[PDB]
Design a protein around this ligand. Sequence first.
Ligand SMILES: Nc1ncnc2c1ncn2[C@@H]1O[C@H](COP(=O)(O)OP(=O)(O)NP(=O)(O)O)[C@@H](O)[C@H]1O
Ligand SMILES: [Mg+2]
Ligand SMILES: [Zn+2]
Lengths: 619, 486
Amino acid sequence: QPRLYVWGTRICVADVQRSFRDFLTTFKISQLAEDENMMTGHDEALHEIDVNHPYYMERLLECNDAEVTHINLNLKHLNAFSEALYRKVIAYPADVIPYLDIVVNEVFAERFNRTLAQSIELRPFNATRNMRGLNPNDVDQLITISGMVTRTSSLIPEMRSGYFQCAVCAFGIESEVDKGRIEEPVVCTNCSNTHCFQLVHNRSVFLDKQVVKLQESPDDMPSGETPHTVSVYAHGSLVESVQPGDRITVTGIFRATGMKVNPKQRALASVYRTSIDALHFRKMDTSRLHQDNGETITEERIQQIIELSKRPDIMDALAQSIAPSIYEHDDVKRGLLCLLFGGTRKDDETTNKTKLRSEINILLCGDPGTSKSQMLQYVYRLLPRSQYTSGKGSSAVGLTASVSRDADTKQLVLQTGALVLADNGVCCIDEFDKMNESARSVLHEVMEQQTLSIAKAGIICQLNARASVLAAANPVDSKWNRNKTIVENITLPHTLLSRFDLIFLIVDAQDEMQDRRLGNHLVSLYFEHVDMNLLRDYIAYAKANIHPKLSEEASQFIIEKYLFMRKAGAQHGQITAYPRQLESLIRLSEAHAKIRLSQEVSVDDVEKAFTLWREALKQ
Amino acid sequence: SEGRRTRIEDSSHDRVIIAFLESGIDKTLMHIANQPREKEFHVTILDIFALILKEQTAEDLATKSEEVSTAEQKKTEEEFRKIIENHVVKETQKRKSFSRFGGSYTIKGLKGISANSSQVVFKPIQNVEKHNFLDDRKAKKRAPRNRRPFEIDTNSHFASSEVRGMLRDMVIRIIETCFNRLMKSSKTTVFVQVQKTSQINYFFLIKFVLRFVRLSRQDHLLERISECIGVEAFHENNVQLTEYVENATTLKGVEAKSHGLKAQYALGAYNELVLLHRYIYEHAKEENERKFAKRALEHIVNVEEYRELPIFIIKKFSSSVLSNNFLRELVLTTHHYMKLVERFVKTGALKKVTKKVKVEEIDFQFDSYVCKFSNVDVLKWYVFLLNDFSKNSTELNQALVKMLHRIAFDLKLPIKLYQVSLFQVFSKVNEHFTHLSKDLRKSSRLYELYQFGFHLLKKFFSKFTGDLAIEALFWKGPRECFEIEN
DNA sequence: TTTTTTTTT
DNA sequence: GTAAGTGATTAGAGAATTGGAGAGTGTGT
DNA sequence: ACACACTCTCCAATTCTCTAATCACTTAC
Ligand SMILES: Nc1ncnc2c1ncn2[C@@H]1O[C@H](COP(=O)(O)OP(=O)(O)NP(=O)(O)O)[C@@H](O)[C@H]1O
Ligand SMILES: [Mg+2]
Ligand SMILES: [Zn+2]
């Protein structure tokens, strides 16, 4: 009996398929600890996975009901079931993956007695290494690496089967493309002429392909190395599933290819180019506020959040849990909590444009050695979409967008900057007083109108940049000077200063008791905070579900407080108030009501917002 | 050069026909043709009416034309429903065929050309029987240019209801006013003349008119075509057909093709003569007419020249000088003639037969007559034409299957049909039937051929042996059949 | 071509 | 009617005509 | 140097003709 073997390895195909069928029908072990992005399915809207069944048999119900066409295969479960199969999967992905697919399709057809539009496809994931640690032994093996997405290409059509037509008698033949090659017919079987066919391109069949560029994480590296970049190829349904600015983990096959010395000729260079063929993208990360509009939270944790919101301590409880290693600065922590929550979104949905800004901007200004950079680092690490820039390390064009000439098409093309990557996120700008004036002056349009309009050679367009700006700086003399006023210790234009919603003056209150307490706190690092898992869910639920509106009493109160602000700002040696500060007060009031999970802004919320704004600046 | 036109609309020839008939000059031409005194115009008028009916068939005009636009709208919507569903199913099958990654594999148990080697494949094959030994690459061998089959193309279309109604009226008026006088005046002269083409026009017009009368069932018109009903018609037709076949076989080149073209039209006219005489003998109301038809049918069945004609033509067939249309016509002619001989044996009217030596009378046996067609030189062309089963007409498919079925189950001799070149046809038919559900298979028009292939292959595999599988590679003669059987 | 960066006058 | 002899038909081999594939060589980019 | 085009040569297929063997018909007992 003829039998099929993988070339040079003595692996037979069917004996693997038997064990994998057993794995699919039988595995139920890990379901006590189901993961965050894997514990829900759906027939319509959303539904929750049951523990007690065979797990992938349960997951196949989603393919029947919601007509999903893929299964995410966690390889840790397979390794727990049988290492003898896990080794074969990792060692020969280019040979065994075309048959585990067929076992899945067989089990689906047997279970449901049904067909589908496309075959159910496998995506193995969660097999980790570094980009520099790859060797020639790893060619065609399964690997997984992580990084940030900087750029994505436009789509490329890749043919799978061509269509020939005879020039003499209009007969037509199909021809499969395989091993990278097509076979051309020579003799027409109808009219019996030779060397006679012509390929018709638009009658043939193509597939999608995309190129994605990935960058090293800087954390793990040894001494003196600069970060590397790698090309990742996405085929089929993975195409356009990721944006620039996202942080991801990729599982795929590591490959190597040759290159021609001249494009005209058959000779090849003996040093090969390398890339990755993708199989799975993962973006789930539990160390940050989650990136998914909070769709998957359970009813029980929603009720726990609703119960937690009724503490009178809710502002202090949420605020002091942020940045736990930082001592005191409670007012600054409350300001950062307001930055995290934000106001109500106010967009034109016909044009997809912001009518009014709802993001909150904060400046910190104070003495040296007061942990401003540390607070910036905490906010940078907490959020999913964040950028960090510092001092003279930035340019005006690099902060916003740049024009460069393309490598092959020789056209001028446009590419992103920090504020465009930080869209729906936070940009942290350290050493803000030491930037070049050219670099600092482009921030006006972004900080006010949340858009960015460009007019250079052949490029006239407008971009959206819905970012929040958090900045830190020193006074003119690096130590705060008491022989000068506030608008002389700070020196920025009024056009720039009026665009911040909060300014925090941090001046060293020199006192022996405060010195002793802070010294005890700092020395102890060498020897009722809300849980991070609850804080994540609280912020996401509040953002998705709470939209405060102003009450009429609150609106009258806001007008009265704005008149008081206009009188107070006019005195000598003080920051003047413009009509922009009325918008700032409305944003802060909505943020306080949003923290309380209230659909209406009250006079108490306006009072708390005004008190925070006033006491931030009276130093 | 003016453009390409579909097969279901009016030809450019039809517009000239419309102008010609709207002028009414055809009535004057018919009036001239009716006069016995004006003989010199008659051959040309016959040529004119044949050239008018050049692009038509009798089946187009025989059915009376009627329509309702409600039914037409419903019918066209169902046609495009068929087209849309075919496209969606084909595209989803093709896009589901593809597979993602590659590799290379060894088929353990199959030998390679080079020593100690197993077979190697470079695509993820589903199962070992899907392997093909890369026959898709290899270039097909061609016949030389002198020996390829060729069709003869007549621009043939389903014209509009207006043109079909006008032509139907013209055909009926010709039969009523001209036909007997015109044919009687022509037959004395057409074969004496120097010019060749009026012979072809003569045979074409005979074939068209007799088929139109039989299919339209206008039985009162049978008096008007009485010039063609006699035994003399069969005699004269047989003489001309024999001369054309001999010249086409013995000459070479375009001259041989030119004589074979005459032979084709003569054969078609002969077939219409046979079918018309059977229709008269079955459905005429007057017993005198029935007796007149019956005596002619008995003459055809009795005399050796009419009974030996199909084998005589089949043994001389050659694709260098005769068209495929000739072979299809010959197969259908043989089918109808053998049905006539079978009925005249079954009713007992044929028992003893005259044979040349002096002439002597010997008993006749229908199985002895059928056994002549089991020769290899006949069965070659039946297997040749069975390859085109997916585009043959249903009548031709029935004729081919019936001739094979007689040898399979009336003479009961399946060893002569055990042959590889027929098993290839069965393989194609089976692949065609895989794409249909069990109900649609019984609904299909090819189910007769499928069922016959089923029974013959089961009879083959009932007693399979390896030496029998070797014997399937060659055509088997009579002693070969005896020694294989015994 | 036009655009962006870092050393020099 | 049966047996033996002679004539005719069929099968094989040799020779000549026709056509197409393949390989080699020359020229142009 | 490499690709493309053109020309020449050989070999195989087919058909006619001649020769030999086997089968069938005719003649004689
Ligand atoms: N209240 C505090 N809580 C925690 N760490 C503190 C505190 N005050 C000072 N530190 C420490 O002192 C250092 C402050 O550095 P840094 O974060 O740069 O402050 P800074 O405001 O940015 N000063 P500078 O950037 O020079 O203007 C860090 O090592 C902190 O850990
Ligand atoms: Mg610092
Ligand atoms: Zn063709």
